[PDB]
Amino acid sequence: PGIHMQIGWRREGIKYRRNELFLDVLESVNLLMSPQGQVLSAHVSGRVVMKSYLSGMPECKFGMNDKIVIEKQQSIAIDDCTFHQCVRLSKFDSERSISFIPPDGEFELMRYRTTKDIILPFRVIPLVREVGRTKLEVKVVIKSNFKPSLLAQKIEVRIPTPLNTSGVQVICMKGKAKYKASENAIVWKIKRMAGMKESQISAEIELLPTNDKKKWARPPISMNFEVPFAPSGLKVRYLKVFEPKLNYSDHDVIKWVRYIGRSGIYETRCDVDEEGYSIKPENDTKENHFYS
């Protein structure tokens, strides 16, 4: 008369020398924008990734800024949500609670979709004034829209060029830029850029008009960037833990949180053991922490 629960995704007797967990919030923000700035199309697809280095059978509870925020007065509006099997869905439907017993090591806790209240990290404003059939004048400004303390990185703006181009001279003060004729685009790279900033690029584009009477469609300005926050607005409120056999809780745990927002289609038009103890697995930016 005693039933033995056996979780298919977590063995028993897991031991870590130090109880700790990792949370990676990985979002791709996509956009189609008009030259004037009208949002024609936008969505974020995100996923919370978790690396559990916890001992025993910990009973966790993931807390974010959902529509429980609407009860206590920034948030994330989740259109669609899919969970790992470990997540009790019963509780999520009754109380919006993401409770679970995590697998050992890395697992994807949830993926999601978002279309409203997206923090669009960048706006591109393009001008193209034709000045004769000889020349084209191109002015492209990029506005960063996030906290000034924060830095976007690995930025690349691909401004398309028309096929009938004999050559182009370009100038920018921030970053570096090359006209890659093979590509049919001037490619503009900036290493870092803080929030609430401007930056301009000007390109005098000389034309060779052989064809006449036909102006064909051209690709839009596409941007790549990496941003240290969730463009959906996702903020991790807590990761509560309770393991009643070993009597330890989140107060006895180190939680490591990271946000990696990355551009998607952002377009604008013109474990092992040893002695019982499990071992953490291991190209990434190095930071000296006391407990690392």
Numbering used by the authors: 153 to 225, 239 to 435, 477 to 488, 492 to 501
What did the publication describing this PDB structure actually write?
To confirm the identity of the extra, Cμ2-proximal electron density as the N terminus of FCHO2 linker, chimeras of Cμ2 alone with N1+N2 attached to the C terminus via 30-residue unstructured synthetic glycine-, serine-, and alanine-rich flexible linkers were then created, crystallized, and their structures solved at resolutions varying from 2.0 to 2.6 Å by MR using an unliganded version of Cμ2 as a search model. The Y pocket is variously filled by parts of the tags of an adjacent Cμ2 molecule. Muniscin family conserved side chains make key interactions with Cμ2 residues 167 to 170, which form the BR3 PtdIns(4,5)P2-binding site. The N1 interaction occurs mainly via complementary charged interactions between Asp318, Glu320, and Glu321 and the Cμ2 BR3 PtdIns(4,5)P2-binding site containing Lys167, Tyr168, and Arg169. Isothermal titration calorimetry (ITC) measurements showed the binding of FCHO2-N1+N2 to have a KD of ~25 μM. Mutation of key binding residues in Cμ2 (E320A+E321A+K326A) reduced binding fivefold, and mutating Tyr323 to serine rendered it unmeasurably weak. The FCHO linker does not directly interact with the Y or Ø cargo motif binding pockets in any structure but does pass close by before its main chain changes direction at FCHO2 Pro327. The weak density that follows on from N1 adopts a range of conformations forming crystal packing contacts, which we believe to be nonphysiological (mutations FCHO2 Y340S and E336A+F339S have little effect on N1-N2 binding). Whereas N1+N2 binds Cμ2 with a KD of around 25 μM, N1 alone (i.e., deletion of N2) reduces binding by ~5-fold, demonstrating that N2 plays a role in binding AP2. In support of this, mutating four of BR4’s basic residues to alanines (BR4-) caused substantial reduction in binding of GST·FCHO2 linker to Cμ2: The lower level of binding reduction of Serinc3 loop results from binding Cμ2 only at BR4 and not to BR3 (43), whereas in FCHO2, N1 can still bind to BR3 even when the BR4:N2 interaction is disrupted.
Proper operation of the pivotal CME cargo adaptor AP2 requires membrane-localized Fer/Cip4 homology domain-only proteins (FCHO). The AP2 complex, composed of α, β2, μ2, and σ2 subunits, is pivotal to mammalian CCV formation, and its deletion is embryonically lethal in mice. FCHO1 and FCHO2 are similar in overall domain arrangement —folded N-terminal acidic phospholipid-binding homodimerization F-BAR domains and C-terminal folded μ-homology domains (μHD) separated by a ~300-residue, low-complexity intrinsically disordered protein linker, which has been suggested to participate in AP2 activation, although how it does so is undetermined. We dissect the network of interactions between the FCHO interdomain linker and AP2, which concentrates, orients, tethers, and partially destabilizes closed AP2 at the plasma membrane.
